Design an enzyme around this catalytic site. Sequence first.
Site, PDB file in Angstrom:
ATOM      1  N   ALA A  63       0.867  -1.168   0.000  1.00 50.03           N
ATOM      2  CA  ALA A  63       0.000   0.000   0.000  1.00 50.03           C
ATOM      3  C   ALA A  63       0.925   1.245   0.000  1.00 50.03           C
ATOM      4  O   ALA A  63       2.156   1.120   0.107  1.00 50.03           O
ATOM      5  CB  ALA A  63      -0.941  -0.012   1.218  1.00 50.03           C
ATOM      6  N   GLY A 109       0.102  -4.764   0.804  1.00 49.82           N
ATOM      7  CA  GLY A 109      -0.971  -4.471  -0.156  1.00 49.82           C
ATOM      8  C   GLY A 109      -0.838  -5.058  -1.541  1.00 49.82           C
ATOM      9  O   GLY A 109      -1.862  -5.357  -2.218  1.00 49.82           O
ATOM     10  N   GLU A 112      -1.662  -8.646  -1.276  1.00 50.04           N
ATOM     11  CA  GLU A 112      -3.095  -8.693  -1.117  1.00 50.04           C
ATOM     12  C   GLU A 112      -3.821  -8.536  -2.472  1.00 50.04           C
ATOM     13  O   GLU A 112      -4.817  -9.203  -2.732  1.00 50.04           O
ATOM     14  CB  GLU A 112      -3.552  -7.678  -0.076  1.00 50.04           C
ATOM     15  CG  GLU A 112      -3.232  -8.091   1.369  1.00 50.04           C
ATOM     16  CD  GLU A 112      -3.483  -6.995   2.415  1.00 50.04           C
ATOM     17  OE1 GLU A 112      -2.948  -5.880   2.252  1.00 50.04           O
ATOM     18  OE2 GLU A 112      -4.195  -7.265   3.399  1.00 50.04           O
ATOM     19  N   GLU A 132       3.219  -5.941   7.267  1.00 50.13           N
ATOM     20  CA  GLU A 132       2.516  -4.843   7.918  1.00 50.13           C
ATOM     21  C   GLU A 132       2.824  -4.722   9.417  1.00 50.13           C
ATOM     22  O   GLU A 132       2.799  -3.615   9.934  1.00 50.13           O
ATOM     23  CB  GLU A 132       1.002  -4.921   7.729  1.00 50.13           C
ATOM     24  CG  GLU A 132       0.499  -4.574   6.303  1.00 50.13           C
ATOM     25  CD  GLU A 132       0.518  -5.749   5.282  1.00 50.13           C
ATOM     26  OE1 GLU A 132       1.291  -6.718   5.457  1.00 50.13           O
ATOM     27  OE2 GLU A 132      -0.180  -5.651   4.220  1.00 50.13           O
TER      28      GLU A 132
END
Lengths: 257, 257, 258
Positions: A63, A109, A112, A132
């Site tokens: 992310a 991210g 993911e 994370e």
Amino acid sequence: MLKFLSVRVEDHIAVATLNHAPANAMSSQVMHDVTELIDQVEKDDNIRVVVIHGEGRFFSAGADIKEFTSVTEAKQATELAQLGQVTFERVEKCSKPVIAAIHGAALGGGLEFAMSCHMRFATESAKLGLPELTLGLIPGFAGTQRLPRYVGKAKACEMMLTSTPITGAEALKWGLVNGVFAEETFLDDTLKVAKQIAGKSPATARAVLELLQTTKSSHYYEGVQREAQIFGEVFTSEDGREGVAAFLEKRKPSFSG
Amino acid sequence: MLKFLSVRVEDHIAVATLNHAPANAMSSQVMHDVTELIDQVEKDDNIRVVVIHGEGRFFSAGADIKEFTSVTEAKQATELAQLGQVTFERVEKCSKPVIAAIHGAALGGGLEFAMSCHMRFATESAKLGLPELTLGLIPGFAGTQRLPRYVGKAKACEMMLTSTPITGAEALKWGLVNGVFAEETFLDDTLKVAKQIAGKSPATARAVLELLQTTKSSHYYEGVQREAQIFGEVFTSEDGREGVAAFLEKRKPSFSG
Amino acid sequence: AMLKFLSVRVEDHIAVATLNHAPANAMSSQVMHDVTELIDQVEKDDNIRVVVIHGEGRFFSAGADIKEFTSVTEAKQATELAQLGQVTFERVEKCSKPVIAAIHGAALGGGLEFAMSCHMRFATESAKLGLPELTLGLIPGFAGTQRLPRYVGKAKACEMMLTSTPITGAEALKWGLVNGVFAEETFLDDTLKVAKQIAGKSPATARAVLELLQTTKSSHYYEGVQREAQIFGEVFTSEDGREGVAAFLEKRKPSFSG
């Protein structure tokens, strides 16, 4: 034309290139572009398969840390988690097969995202992980639900609690990717697979994709709800603020519970 | 009593040989025979374990596609699918352990048969796959639900969408078989397993088998029903007709759905 | 109550627990009480961030304790002992702090069930892992019938329980029954390195991960555990169960009636 995704269709295969230099971070804008790609793919009868890969060195390194700084509050954080969850559920629900072609790394991210694709291929030395917790956060784009359903609860536990990524070769062993290819021909070798899939009738491709979704239980869906709620809580906690501040300041965080 | 299966009991091991020339295709009559074999196995106190293998080149090369061409309506195709599904559920629910010993190939309906057995052993070079999409069809004997619960949905997707089989060695890596043996002593090595199993108390084998069924959810069962419904729709579609006709005539099908 | 057959030391936020019920680290009722106390201690102590459990001597744990499963024990008591183990092991799996099992020698029967209730496992390459209960004309009664297939798949679990044959640590890694294997010479130390990585994480994220991982267990897993204890009692007092245990104590092969 989308801002950070370019698409070229050849022989019913939409090759979508993620291009958010230099590490293809899954920012809010990139998520919007992903949703638009899925919309486009679903409406274009000429498109039978989609292959997604990253421009530059990486598939996607995470992310976008810039959306998770001190300036952001708990409601926005939960909402950002939910934007990624919704976006990646759209990918996984796509009525046309979506293949992630991973080189370099798919982290956080980025993994993911890859995980929401129907199939993944990687190079042997690609790094795949959910780091994370290094930030004092948790995966917030459904990673806590998708990862153990690929690699089992135990491996998923280890990967999340240590934050250490695994290689493409190891991800193959653990069932996180379909296969590995050489770096030299990697995108071409993935396109060969896409081309085989493009030969099948659309109604049967659609059917297989639908029938594969039966493992997504109400326990899964409620886990995703829970993950978003927890994400916001840890994000605005003292330890979550410290973890993110420490990363940006290139220092080891100090967590106090 | 049994047309294309023959069963011989020695030392509490029922060895069932499927022989439906040329390819051990899983026809309606075969389904009937399998149901009878399971009732026989459960009721004969002398039987403690069943080993199922194919006569000739193959375990089974698929459903009986010739018999499929007797279908004139979606409902009939759905009924044929349901017959296989019901038959294989009776296998999986069997209160005595059932081992599939796969040499050569287990494809399509034949793999779906093997997947309903409690355990599977294979030769390194055996071919295991679900090629139904080459016919413009989907698997209709619960293969869409069972396969991803063995190998993961990613690998299952790849298998169904490409139609490419995997080797016995690969099936082991992916958890689709228990073990692989050398092709020369394959059936002997499988029988050594069955003999170890025959040493256990019948009530404990029954208990273990019952307790293993908790892995099957309502979503699995609903998935099987939906698979049967979809199967009949794709079967009588233009692309379904073309794919079957093309297979029977040994040419490449031309899909335009 | 001092722990009877467990010892615990705490270093760098890692509780290192050593099972010591000689000679085989059998999971007796007293051992279950010790495990429950350990989890109680661990959850209460903010200084403990991770637990590593291993066995003293030759084994992690070679089984439940045969002394509690003789002709003198009746059905109700057998079901209750199964339930004791199941409840104790659920406490372990539900622990808010990460629990790692470090297996050397063997984790068999009740011992493997124990290790399976931990969040992660590491083993030596030659450690033996299995559920040999059907040798006794019994079934696994401490949730093994539900946990094992969710690690290795129902097919491999079926084979392991029906043949009673253990697998090596290296095979257990292939089948997803352990996280990793380490050299026998540096085994505990290598496991502690993993524990130390995990102890660097915030307690709230570690708790969250563990909680979010719970969603993998279905209502049928929980019903299954209860049914397992019910069946365990029935088979325990059956002619075949009584015979398997007696044959085991007499060092001979069992002969079963049905």
